[PDB]
Ligand SMILES: COc1ccc(S(=O)(=O)N(CC(C)C)C[C@@H](O)[C@H](Cc2ccccc2)NC(=O)O[C@H]2CO[C@H]3O[C@@H]4OCC[C@@H]4[C@H]32)cc1
Ligand SMILES: [Cl-]
């Protein structure tokens with residue numbers, strides 16, 4: 001698809017069998033998801049946004065569908081104001097920025 | 100141009116006669132620039148993201164050249180850790196997400 005940016009580029013994702021809404025975010029290195037349960041072990045990570053840092057739980061090789069495209073990669077979980085799909089999984093679904 | 104997302108989508112911008120590097124950021128509603136002076140009136144605003152909120156000064160009708168494309172709109176200025184081109188100006192240069 002071709003997505004214009006007059007509105008937020010929100011898409012449906014599926015993770016852990018659950019449907020969620022997420023922002024396709026070229027300004028995010030990482031994929032950041034609201035508090036939820038994921039399988040396996042996690043390791044710690046500090047991510048920094050506009051208003052400082054938050055601690056998150058990093059899970060690798062998580063299976064997630066994004067706007068209908070399968071990805072498998074790292075997802076970090078923590079107190080984000082919105083689910084964010086960052087460049088690590090945008091590259092997996094073949095997304096580009098064009099103008 | 101077509102920008103792949105293996106790396107941060109950083110471009111050169113010109114604003115207020117200065118050159119800066121900025122992130123093309125589809126996850127950003129607004130265009131947020133680090134502390135600088137801009138001409139005209141301004142009003143205070145709070146904007147928030149990962150970590151919390153920052154106070155910024157909102158300037159209207161500001162022209163920015165974004166990787167060679169001129170665009171005009173609101174720019175907010177404050178203690179952001181990175182210069183960000185948000186959707187309010189990405190739309191003006193015709194930027195889209197494609198996959
Ligand atoms: C109202 O208008 C706004 C409101 C909010 C924002 S924002 O900067 O807070 N953000 C909104 C979003 C979190 C809902 C835009 C994002 O693109 C920021 C943009 C951003 C980038 C860097 C630093 C600060 C902000 N990215 C970001 O926080 O990425 C996080 C997660 O991944 C890491 O990669 C990034 O690079 C490493 C750190 C960040 C980490 C911008 C304009
Ligand atoms: Cl919107």
Ligand SMILES: [Cl-]
Nearest residue numbers: 011012067068
């Ligand atoms: Cl979708």
Ligand SMILES: [Cl-]
Nearest residue numbers: 072073074088
């Ligand atoms: Cl990954």
Ligand SMILES: [Cl-]
Nearest residue numbers: 171172173187
């Ligand atoms: Cl605007």
Ligand SMILES: [Cl-]
Nearest residue numbers: 004005190193
């Ligand atoms: Cl358009």
Ligand code: NA
Nearest residue numbers: 040041060061
């Ligand atoms: Na795992």
Ligand code: NA
Nearest residue numbers: 139140159160
């Ligand atoms: Na103005």
